[PDB]
Every structure is written in structure tokens, then in C-alpha cells.
Amino acid sequence: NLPTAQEVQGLMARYIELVDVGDIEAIVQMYADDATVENPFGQPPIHGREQIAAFYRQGLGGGKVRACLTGPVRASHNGCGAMPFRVEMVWNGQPCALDVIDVMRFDEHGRIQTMQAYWSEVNLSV
Amino acid sequence: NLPTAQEVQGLMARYIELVDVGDIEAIVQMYADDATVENPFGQPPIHGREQIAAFYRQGLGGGKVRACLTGPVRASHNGCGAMPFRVEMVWNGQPCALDVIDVMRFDEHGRIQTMQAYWSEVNLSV
Numbered sequence A, B: 001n002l003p004t005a006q007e008v009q010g011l012m013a014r015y016i017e018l019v020d021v022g023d024i025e026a027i028v029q030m031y032a033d034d035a036t037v038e039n040p041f042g043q044p045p046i047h048g049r050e051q052i053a054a055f056y057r058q059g060l061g062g063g064k065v066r067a068c069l070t071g072p073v074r075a076s077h078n079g080c081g082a083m084p085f086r087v088e089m090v091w092n093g094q095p096c097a098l099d100v101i102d103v104m105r106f107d108e109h110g111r112i113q114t115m116q117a118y119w120s121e122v123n124l125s126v
Helices: A005-021 A024-030 A049-060 B005-021 B024-030 B048-060
Strands: A031-038 A066-069 A080-091 A094-106 A112-118 B031-038 B066-069 B080-091 B094-106 B112-118
Touching: A005 A024, A005 A066, A005 A080, A005 A094, A024 A031, A024 A049, A031 A049, A080 B094, A080 B112, A094 B080, A094 B094, A112 B080, B005 B024, B005 B066, B005 B080, B005 B094, B024 B031, B024 B048, B031 B048
Parallel strands: A031 A112, B031 B112
Antiparallel strands: A066 A080, A080 A094, A094 A112, B066 B080, B080 B094, B094 B112
């Protein structure tokens, strides 16, 4: 159901693990039907499951992307949480790192209803 | 005006410095006159500088508190950002620490319009 604080910590950690191995189908399953993705926050929300899958396959398709928590998950009692992490990727044909904070709201089924990924170019390191 | 990504990084870092030193009046002046605070996220919003001042005095006025960033500020291009930090307090007569992520939205005068502090008891260490 609506994840407890401890369950939010578990779910958000699981998200990171799935991104880190690059299981696109498993990531998309975490999302609710009405989910929205704002990534980076400030850009228009992505919605529709096909569209969210296309977003992740575009980002993770190369198969080389890595991700890890860089601090503990902060969770609420209303099914939300926030986490700091770092993504290792490739930009301009070179290895890079991107520092991100994700804010997630889960629904009463334990699926992601809204996600918001905070980062900009100030958070990229070549 | 509406802070750029770099300006958001600067403002949110300054906020941490003000909490760390406990300058309640300076903190309150970083907020818009009609700002809303949700701390912890999940609890009822408090509204306006009078209420926000009372909230920070309750948290910071008594026993002395320390605060520091535990990772970089993640900023957007629409005047928003998110940051991870740790608050050190004295509970009972013994030290405790609280891991928090704040999300802030600034207005076009450079003041905090809204903020959300993500944490729960899972983030406390006595």
C-alpha cells in the first residue's frame, strides 16, 4: 500500500539499484499509470507509460550508466521521499559525473506517482 | 530577480550558513513575506514571516544547533533547488544529528517562496 517511511527508503534505494544495472522494464514497472516525470526539474513533465519508457531507454540505452546513493534517503510519513545520488555517464564522448537529487511521491499502491529530478549543468563534472 | 542556477546554489548555501550560526532574523528575511514552510514535509504548512520566525526560534533559539551541507546544491533553471545537509543538535543532554533534504522555490526577488524539508525519525541519530 502507501509506503511507510521505511518502505519509501526501500523503494527509492531499489530505484537506484535498477538504474545502476540498467533494467529499463523493471524501472518503468515502478511507475503508476498516471505518473509524471520532471527530469530535469524545470523541463515539461513527461507522462504516459510508453513515453516514460522511451525516456529511460534513451538515457540508459547505452548500457554503461552507473548510479549510487551519496547520502541516506530522506522519507516522509505521507509516502514521499528525497535522495542524493551521483550518475556516471558519457557526455561529448567523455566520461562524466552528474550529481542529482530525486524527489518522489508514491501512491497508495506503492508505485511512483510523481518524480522530480533536480540537477543542472552546474552539477556536471567532466 | 528570479535566481539563476548559480544564484540558487549561492542562496541555498547562505541559508545553511545562517542556520549554522543561528541568525533567526537573517533566515526570516531570506523568506518571502508570505512564504510557506513544510517541515517536515507531510506536516501542515506554516505561512508568513511571523509564523516562520516562531518556527525557527523554537528550533534554533534554545540549545545551539550546527548545520552543514553534505553534498552540493542541485539547482534548476526555474528558480528552484534541492540540497542535502545534516543538522547537529543536543537532545536530552547528549548530541544528536538529523539528515535532511530541503527543496526551495525562489521568487523573482530572490526570496524563498516555498520550501519543503524532507526527513523523518529514520533520519535521526541520538
